[PDB]
Design an enzyme around this catalytic site. Sequence first.
Site, mmCIF file in Angstrom:
data_model
loop_
_atom_site.group_PDB
_atom_site.id
_atom_site.type_symbol
_atom_site.label_atom_id
_atom_site.label_comp_id
_atom_site.label_asym_id
_atom_site.label_seq_id
_atom_site.Cartn_x
_atom_site.Cartn_y
_atom_site.Cartn_z
ATOM 1 N N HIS A 61 21.699 6.533 -1.392
ATOM 2 C CA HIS A 61 22.343 6.495 0.103
ATOM 3 C C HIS A 61 23.974 5.864 -0.290
ATOM 4 O O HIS A 61 24.854 5.923 0.573
ATOM 5 C CB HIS A 61 21.703 5.645 1.182
ATOM 6 C CG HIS A 61 20.185 6.003 1.278
ATOM 7 N ND1 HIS A 61 19.841 7.176 1.956
ATOM 8 C CD2 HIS A 61 19.035 5.384 0.939
ATOM 9 C CE1 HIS A 61 18.549 7.120 2.129
ATOM 10 N NE2 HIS A 61 18.241 6.214 1.362
ATOM 11 N N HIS A 91 28.070 -2.893 -2.089
ATOM 12 C CA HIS A 91 28.304 -1.332 -1.984
ATOM 13 C C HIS A 91 29.521 -0.809 -0.941
ATOM 14 O O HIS A 91 30.035 -1.760 -0.483
ATOM 15 C CB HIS A 91 27.112 -0.964 -1.462
ATOM 16 C CG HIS A 91 26.645 -1.293 -0.040
ATOM 17 N ND1 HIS A 91 26.240 -2.473 0.133
ATOM 18 C CD2 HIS A 91 27.002 -0.700 1.139
ATOM 19 C CE1 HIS A 91 25.777 -2.540 1.615
ATOM 20 N NE2 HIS A 91 26.378 -1.535 2.145
ATOM 21 N N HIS A 93 30.703 2.352 1.860
ATOM 22 C CA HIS A 93 30.541 3.765 2.787
ATOM 23 C C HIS A 93 31.738 4.472 2.645
ATOM 24 O O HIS A 93 32.811 3.706 2.914
ATOM 25 C CB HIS A 93 30.160 3.365 4.076
ATOM 26 C CG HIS A 93 28.822 2.294 4.331
ATOM 27 N ND1 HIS A 93 27.562 2.887 4.361
ATOM 28 C CD2 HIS A 93 28.734 1.043 4.132
ATOM 29 C CE1 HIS A 93 26.667 1.851 4.431
ATOM 30 N NE2 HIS A 93 27.391 0.591 4.037
ATOM 31 N N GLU A 103 32.703 2.383 8.723
ATOM 32 C CA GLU A 103 31.387 2.093 9.689
ATOM 33 C C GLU A 103 32.112 1.504 10.696
ATOM 34 O O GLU A 103 32.016 1.939 11.965
ATOM 35 C CB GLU A 103 30.317 1.433 9.019
ATOM 36 C CG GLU A 103 29.734 2.161 7.765
ATOM 37 C CD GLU A 103 28.388 1.738 7.518
ATOM 38 O OE1 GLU A 103 27.908 0.772 7.272
ATOM 39 O OE2 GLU A 103 27.434 2.766 7.772
ATOM 40 N N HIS A 116 30.987 -3.387 1.753
ATOM 41 C CA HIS A 116 30.248 -4.576 2.157
ATOM 42 C C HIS A 116 29.662 -5.429 0.840
ATOM 43 O O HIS A 116 28.943 -4.904 0.186
ATOM 44 C CB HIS A 116 29.085 -4.017 2.761
ATOM 45 C CG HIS A 116 29.151 -3.006 4.368
ATOM 46 N ND1 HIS A 116 28.526 -2.105 4.647
ATOM 47 C CD2 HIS A 116 30.541 -3.240 4.989
ATOM 48 C CE1 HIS A 116 29.276 -1.668 5.864
ATOM 49 N NE2 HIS A 116 30.330 -2.388 5.910
ATOM 50 N N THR A 195 23.356 -1.653 8.779
ATOM 51 C CA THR A 195 23.869 -0.497 9.191
ATOM 52 C C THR A 195 22.901 0.755 8.530
ATOM 53 O O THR A 195 23.130 1.934 9.044
ATOM 54 C CB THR A 195 25.161 -0.291 8.655
ATOM 55 O OG1 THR A 195 25.467 -0.071 7.398
ATOM 56 C CG2 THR A 195 26.196 -1.107 9.397
HETATM 57 ZN ZN LIG Z 1 27.082 -1.340 3.969
#
Ligand SMILES: [Zn+2]
EC number: 4.2.1.1
Length: 257
Positions: A61, A91, A93, A103, A116, A195
């Site tokens: 992911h 990590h 997104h 996000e 994050h 999240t």
């Molecule tokens: Zn995250």
Amino acid sequence: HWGYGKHNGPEHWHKDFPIAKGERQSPVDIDTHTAKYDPSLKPLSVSYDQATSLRILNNGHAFNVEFDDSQDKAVLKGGPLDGTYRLIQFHFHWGSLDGQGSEHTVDKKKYAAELHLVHWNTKYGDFGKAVQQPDGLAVLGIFLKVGSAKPGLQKVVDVLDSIKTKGKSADFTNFDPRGLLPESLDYWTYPGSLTTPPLLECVTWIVLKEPISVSSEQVLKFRKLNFNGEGEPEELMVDNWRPAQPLKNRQIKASFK
Ligand SMILES: [Zn+2]
């Protein structure tokens, strides 16, 4: 199982994780005019000089850069936080296009990506215990925009070829996360959640106002990663972001005037 596709994406998550429709879900839109300056917010303390990175993992992911969190080495404190929070991993997104990927949003603006840095409250002893607590985690969120390259990110970018597919990991020692921080530590903060499933409501969110810049080439290499495992049909790891959730009964506080 859950993911970011048409049939298993964010709009489906509530069926396995009913807390998806909970009272303090993340991310949220940060309405900058409604956020209120809170003069009682102590200064934020980011102490990453003794950080020990170990490994980088494609978990299907995102990719996680993992740290040794068995001692107080890299820690976050101050700001809205009580006590000491230990860095366990970071990590990102990101999007399929530069106009989406983050996000959190800022006055509905989407950034190309969001970093994050995940920390857990040491008073709970371990990460697994911490995620069961309302004040168990502190996540430092940093927006990425596309422009000039971020030199401190390049070592991450260049190892991604070795972890293209789900379940692959690689040694990743001596990486200094201080190279991913913007100049200013001005921030917004609010109580929220993970999240990703299980979407536990255990996070104090601290989102920096100042984005970092990364190059088009750098984010393009993020987009060459795979959601799938090796020897499976290629699905590019892109748009692995949850959209903004209802703010409900929460106030976003600003550290700055
Ligand atoms: Zn995250």
